[PDB]
Design an enzyme around this catalytic site. Structure first.
Site, PDB file in Angstrom:
ATOM      1  N   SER A 281      33.003  46.154  45.885  1.00  0.00           N
ATOM      2  CA  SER A 281      33.148  47.601  45.707  1.00  0.00           C
ATOM      3  C   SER A 281      31.806  48.309  45.970  1.00  0.00           C
ATOM      4  O   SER A 281      31.224  48.160  47.044  1.00  0.00           O
ATOM      5  CB  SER A 281      33.652  47.919  44.302  1.00  0.00           C
ATOM      6  OG  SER A 281      34.240  49.205  44.292  1.00  0.00           O
TER       7      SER A 281
ATOM      8  N   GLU B 290      44.230  46.729  47.548  1.00  0.00           N
ATOM      9  CA  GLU B 290      43.026  47.483  47.257  1.00  0.00           C
ATOM     10  C   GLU B 290      43.203  48.751  46.426  1.00  0.00           C
ATOM     11  O   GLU B 290      42.309  49.087  45.658  1.00  0.00           O
ATOM     12  CB  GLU B 290      42.299  47.836  48.554  1.00  0.00           C
ATOM     13  CG  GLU B 290      41.594  46.670  49.256  1.00  0.00           C
ATOM     14  CD  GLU B 290      40.401  46.142  48.482  1.00  0.00           C
ATOM     15  OE1 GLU B 290      39.822  45.114  48.892  1.00  0.00           O
ATOM     16  OE2 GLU B 290      40.035  46.754  47.463  1.00  0.00           O
TER      17      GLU B 290
ATOM     18  N   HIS C 180      41.938  45.554  43.192  1.00  0.00           N
ATOM     19  CA  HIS C 180      40.544  45.718  43.540  1.00  0.00           C
ATOM     20  C   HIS C 180      39.696  44.979  42.535  1.00  0.00           C
ATOM     21  O   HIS C 180      39.797  45.240  41.341  1.00  0.00           O
ATOM     22  CB  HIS C 180      40.226  47.212  43.491  1.00  0.00           C
ATOM     23  CG  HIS C 180      38.858  47.578  43.981  1.00  0.00           C
ATOM     24  ND1 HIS C 180      38.485  47.480  45.305  1.00  0.00           N
ATOM     25  CD2 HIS C 180      37.783  48.081  43.325  1.00  0.00           C
ATOM     26  CE1 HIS C 180      37.242  47.905  45.443  1.00  0.00           C
ATOM     27  NE2 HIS C 180      36.794  48.276  44.255  1.00  0.00           N
TER      28      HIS C 180
END
Ligand code: NAG
Lengths: 61, 535
Positions: free
Chosen positions: B201, B328, B441
């Site tokens: 990230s 995601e 994610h």
């Protein structure tokens, strides 16, 4: 009644608010981040949403 | 001072580490090593400074404070959200890094992996369980470093052009640790000539900012970006928008009009908490996957915008590993999109789907949003609640991670870099997020780090087997630049991603499978068309 308590900077702990209302303060528009929880029912602000309960335990979740 | 193995002299002074128990053996952990002077008081918003030397033997057997940050309390008691909360006290005095080495110490320069944590640049800590490098050290003889860097306003509040609030200081904190690893990693047995950065990230985006910023480019050799990039809708902001947000936050907290010097001076008398209480209110549009203070294109750290830099830099010398997870965008939806909660199936109406697109693609014009709805709707069944729900997820993930990554992969490959790409498709068995969220994610991190290698943690045998494979690819990529094998001709190869074939691989329990084109038609929409429709 037990409730969650925390600020924008502390983890949610559970506390005895006795017999008072509990509150959930979060950002009213996306992103709707929860800004805080605790005893009482502080007035909402249209920018900040405040939902209050009276029971049962952990109701301000 | 008995185990000479836990005694180390870095340039600053003597350090004492602690022996830790991995699952197969022991590791030397050196925790809480201060790599910079505490950036408090007048140093707030300022660039980090090297830690002055110390006399005596400093205790490095514990994790240090976590950088002042917002704590995500959306779901009290839920492990999905809480596994990311800080696990140590919050302080502005937080620029410390950690080092794991196997036990005993290695006899030959071992390759180094430096981890940069994610958390949207507003949260994060190198001390969370998921970043425990005891496993990589014990099982792969890895030498692993992980640092804390300022997040939020402290890490990124900027007033471009001013000396007292230049911006990107959180990235500089990162670089300083990189400088530290250079001048000292040798004393721990780490090869300072084989440094591999890797993050997820915002961490992955940071890594990319290091590749793009020359000063940082000489402090490492390889890089891995998992689910994030420097290019993209959320990793950076323009100087105009940064200043906009800084001067608006300043207004909210009572600071006061205002010229830079005195505005920042006022901001430094402000209580840390007070800044965080207003952090979330400067975002320009109602949205999700948007963070208030992120890296700013200042023309200093970032000579130009990432987009520019990735279409014009030379990446001949570059070896990259990039990838994304299956879903995601899953959990971001739950942060404000009408109709999504972790508590139910989150089925939505076409009308909710329409409202949702504006929130998921916040900077999109009425026309752009319109084009998005077009592209993501299945015109045979335009109202199926399930498809809409999934499409919403896909909109958000593709816009923020998948396509920015594919763009990156493409541009880098097209400029001499040796790129390897993947898609993580394995949903952990312990996952507490609702099943509809698929593989969310950040849920590949645990497997890469090897946590299922811990008998104490509930997982399946397959999963532990799976873990090792990953630990292997990463470390091989780490030390050679290729994820494969210095011998045993592995029957299933991972080919480098190229603009011609666009091959990438699927990391899951099954053996490797080679695929072509990263959501190719869809990312053309995102990367080639929409930007023409917004200019
Ligand atoms: C799911 O829960 C949220 C809030 O609890 C609500 O807004 C939404 O309508 C619910 N969806 C379903 C399945 O009714």
């Amino acid at each position: 009644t037990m409730c969650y308590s925390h600020t924008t900077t502390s983890r949610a702990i559970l506390t005895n608010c006795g017999e008072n209302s509990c509150y959930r303060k979060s950002r009213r528009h996306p992103p709707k981040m929860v800004l805080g929880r605790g005893c009482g029912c502080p007035p909402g602000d249209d920018n900040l949403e405040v939902k209050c309960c009276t029971s049962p335990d952990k109701c301000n979740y | 001072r008995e185990d000479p193995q836990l005694l180390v002299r870095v340039r600053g002074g003597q350090l004492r580490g602690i022996r830790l128990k991995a699952p197969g053996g022991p590791v030397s952990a050196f925790l809480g090593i201060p790599f910079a002077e505490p950036p408090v008081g007048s140093r707030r918003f300022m660039p980090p400074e090297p830690k002055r030397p110390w006399s005596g033997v400093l205790d490095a057997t514990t994790f240090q404070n976590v950088c002042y940050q917002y704590v995500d309390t959306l779901y009290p008691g839920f492990e999905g959200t809480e596994m990311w909360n800080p696990n140590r006290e919050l302080s502005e005095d937080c620029l410390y890094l950690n080092v794991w080495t196997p036990y005993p110490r290695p006899a030959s320069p071992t390759p180094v992996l430096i981890w940069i944590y994610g958390g949207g640049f507003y949260s994060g800590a190198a001390s969370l369980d998921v970043y425990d490098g005891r496993f990589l050290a014990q099982v792969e003889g890895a030498v692993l470093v992980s640092m804390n860097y300022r997040v939020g306003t402290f890490g990124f509040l900027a007033l471009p052009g001013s000396r007292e609030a230049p911006g990107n200081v959180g990235l500089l904190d990162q670089r300083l640790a990189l400088q530290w690893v250079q001048e000292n990693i040798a004393a721990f047995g780490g090869d300072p000539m084989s440094v591999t950065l890797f993050g997820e990230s915002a961490g992955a985006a940071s890594v990319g900012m290091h590749i793009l910023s020359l000063p940082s480019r000489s402090l490492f050799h390889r890089a891995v970006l998992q689910s994030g990039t420097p290019n993209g809708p959320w990793a950076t902001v323009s100087a105009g928008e940064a200043r906009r947000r800084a001067t608006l936050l300043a207004r909210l907290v009572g600071c006061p009009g205002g010229n830079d010097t005195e505005l920042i001076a006022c901001l430094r008398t402000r209580p840390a908490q007070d800044l965080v209480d207003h952090e979330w209110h400067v975002l320009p549009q109602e949205s999700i996957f948007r963070f208030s203070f992120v890296p700013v294109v200042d023309g200093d750290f970032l000579s130009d915008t990432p987009e520019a830099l990735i279409n014009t830099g030379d990446f001949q010398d570059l070896q990259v590993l990039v990838g994304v997870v299956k879903d995601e965008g899953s959990y971001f939806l739950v942060y404000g999109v009408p109709g999504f909660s972790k508590d139910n199936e989150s089925l939505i109406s076409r009308a909710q789907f329409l409202a949702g697109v504006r929130i998921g693609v916040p900077q999109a014009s009425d026309l752009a949003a319109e084009a998005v709805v077009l592209h993501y709707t299945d015109w045979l069944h335009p109202e199926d609640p399930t498809h809409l729900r999934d499409a919403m997820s896909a909109v958000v993930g593709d816009h923020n991670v998948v396509c920015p990554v594919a763009q990156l992969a493409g541009r880098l490959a097209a400029q001499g870099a040796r790129v390897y790409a993947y898609i993580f498709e394995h949903r952990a068995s312990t996952l507490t997020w609702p099943l509809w969220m698929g593989v969310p994610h950040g849920y590949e991190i645990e497997f890469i780090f090897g946590l299922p290698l811990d008998p104490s943690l509930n997982y399946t045998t397959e999963e532990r087997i799976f873990a090792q494979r990953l630990m292997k690819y990463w470390t091989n990529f780490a030390r050679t630049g290729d994820p494969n094998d210095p011998r045993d001709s592995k029957s299933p190869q991972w080919p480098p991603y190229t603009t011609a074939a666009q091959q990438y691989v699927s990391l899951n329990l099954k053996p490797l499978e080679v695929r072509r084109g990263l959501r190719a038609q869809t990312c053309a929409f995102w990367n080639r068309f929409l930007p023409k429709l917004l200019s």
